[PDB]
Swiss-Prot record:
Residues 111-200 are annotated as: Alpha-1. Changing residue 273 to E: In allele A*80:01; requires 2 nucleotide substitutions. GO terms for biological process: antibacterial humoral response; antigen processing and presentation of endogenous peptide antigen via MHC class I; antigen processing and presentation of endogenous peptide antigen via MHC class I via ER pathway, TAP-dependent; antigen processing and presentation of endogenous peptide antigen via MHC class I via ER pathway, TAP-independent; antigen processing and presentation of endogenous peptide antigen via MHC class Ib; antigen processing and presentation of exogenous peptide antigen via MHC class I; CD8-positive, alpha-beta T cell activation; defense response to Gram-positive bacterium. Changing residue 154 to K: In alleles A*01:01 and allele A*36:01. A peptide antigen 1 binds at residues 117, 183, 194, 253, 256, 269, 281. It is a single-pass type I membrane protein. Changing residue 166 to R: In allele A*30:01 and allele A*31:01. Keywords: Adaptive immunity, Cell membrane, Disulfide bond, Endoplasmic reticulum, Glycoprotein, Host-virus interaction, Immunity, Immunoglobulin domain, Innate immunity, Membrane, MHC I, Phosphoprotein, Signal, Sulfation, Transmembrane, Transmembrane helix, Ubl conjugation. Heterotrimer that consists of an alpha chain HLA-A, a beta chain B2M and a peptide (peptide-HLA-A-B2M). Early in biogenesis, HLA-A-B2M dimer interacts with the components of the peptide-loading complex composed of TAPBP, TAP1-TAP2, TAPBPL, PDIA3/ERP57 and CALR. Interacts with TAP1-TAP2 transporter via TAPBP; this interaction is obligatory for the loading of peptide epitopes delivered to the ER by TAP1-TAP2 transporter. (Microbial infection) Interacts with HHV-8 MIR1 protein. GO terms for molecular function: beta-2-microglobulin binding; CD8 receptor binding; peptide antigen binding; RNA binding; signaling receptor binding; T cell receptor binding; TAP binding; TAP complex binding. A peptide antigen 2 binds at residues 226, 269. This is HLA class I histocompatibility antigen, A alpha chain.
Amino acid sequence: YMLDLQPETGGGIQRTPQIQVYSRHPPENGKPNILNCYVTQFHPSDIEIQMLKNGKKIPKVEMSDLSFSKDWSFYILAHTEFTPTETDTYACRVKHASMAEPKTVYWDRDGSHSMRYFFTSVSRPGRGEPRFIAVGYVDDTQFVRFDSDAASQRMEPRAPWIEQEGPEYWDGETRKVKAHSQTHRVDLGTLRGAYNQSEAGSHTVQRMYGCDVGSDWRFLRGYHQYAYDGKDYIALKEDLRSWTAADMAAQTTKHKWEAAHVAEQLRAYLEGTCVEWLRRYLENGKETLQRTDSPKAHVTYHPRSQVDVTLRCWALGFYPADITLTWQLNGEDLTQDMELVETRPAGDGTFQKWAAVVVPLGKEQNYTCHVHHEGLPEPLTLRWENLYF
């Protein structure tokens, strides 16, 4: 349930995509599966993602709705059905303005809750109104979307439990999401003026807001923050009464919103309405939302040099996405030379992660992987049982 308040900011750089290519389920030759291409850390949001089989474009590839993480960097999941074999190669190819050439990555085998909305507007001077994309989450489960270039021109369901809501709900959310788009359109215009930028270039406004509740479903935290061209602009501080302005232009907005008492209006939504609707969603989506799936963990071996080995600690099938995955040598922990990938979606309501370390041969028993997750009664501790080396 979105905010009705629409404050305006007032009148007076590229990052490279990271790519993971991986299957939803453990890969077995001849068994139907889903291949994922998880593309993250990119800016601006305009991007082309293609999945390839033996170098040829796979035609039926589904893309997630554009969203972004805390640092404002975008992410998209692309996925397609596939049945792996011994000989077929698979890859994901990304074109983005940050890179001179496309990057191709081949598939290689060996108690709290939150509601959050994420909004992205991208100007396109001479080509109509900004591209506007909105997505809503409860915890790590997306439940609504809006895309200005989609056909419906309505807020749309993306989870079965929200489809219960009647037409009044959908009408209200559609009205509000369109109002968000217009506010962002205005913001793009005035921010362009504030930074003395030309009317020709494309620019980006991102906005995130929402609430966390505790184990008793009482208000825990609120958020309401903005970025311009992928950089912090203004953010509501944790007290929900003051602002962090990132530069001089944002200070003008800060003083404007201070004068108009915008923080107190947002506080009322964040501590009241946001929380009340989160509780409703948690009850309506109980089976899928009020759940913890524990990480299914194991350690794999991979020969490296004649002197050492790579040990990789896997965590699979877990929900929610928050997890701590760490290696420890002889009790003491250290992330000096630990490779750690971003937590990635399986595409079926669970997440995956791994952490890898290079261990000298003979000293493998000294290394232990530790998995902490709210689903686990006790933290898991794993070691590589050396059978066949």
